[PDB]
Design a protein around this ligand. Structure first.
Ligand SMILES: Cn1cc(C(=O)NCCN)ccc1=O
Length: 103
């Protein structure tokens, strides 16, 4: 239980973070040119939110794999100095930090 409750703590904190604006909702491929082709397995916070509430996570590790996928996808598609990229690095460092001062 305590595994999944901190996933709630960290997802909530990521949802309300200042730099979370690029990851709240799935990327719209109609609007983002080339995203469908480049990103095979998209992931975002709302999709993680949906899965967590239905309890579709077996361990904290499956949750972390989805979080890392958000930021891997971000670094794959966006330049490190882009606005989305700059925001992804803040979010990735925030996640790794808060994930470690638990485990
Ligand atoms: C994660 N990600 C977000 C965007 C974006 O523009 N998000 C704000 C929505 N209006 C573009 C490329 C990308 O990889």
């Amino acid at each position: 239980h305590s595994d999944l409750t901190f996933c709630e703590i960290i997802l909530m904190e990521m949802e309300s973070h200042d730099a979370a604006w690029p990851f709240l909702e799935p990327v719209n491929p109609r609007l983002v040119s080339g995203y469908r082709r480049i990103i095979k397995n998209p992931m975002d916070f709302s999709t993680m939110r949906e899965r967590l509430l239905r309890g579709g996570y077996t361990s904290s590790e499956e949750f972390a794999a989805d979080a890392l996928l958000v930021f891997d996808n971000c670094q794959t598609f966006n330049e490190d100095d882009s606005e989305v990229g700059k925001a992804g690095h803040i979010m990735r460092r925030f996640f790794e930090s808060r994930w470690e001062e638990f485990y």
